[PDB]
Write a structure and sequence with these properties.
By secondary structure, the protein is largely without helices or strands. It is 0% helix and 0% strand. It has no helix or strand. The chain binds a DNA duplex through loops. It is found in: Nucleus; Chromosome. Interacts with HIPK2.
Length: 10
DNA sequence: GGGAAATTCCTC
DNA sequence: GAGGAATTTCCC
């Protein structure tokens, strides 16, 4: 749904 | 535990 | 519709 603002996971 | 980068969400 | 701005995570 709504993905917060951040750097992708490893 | 600090500095740097990627993707996302919103406006015009 | 494309660009600009804000927030979060990773490596050493």
């Amino acid at each position: 749904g709504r993905k917060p603002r951040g750097r992708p996971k490893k």
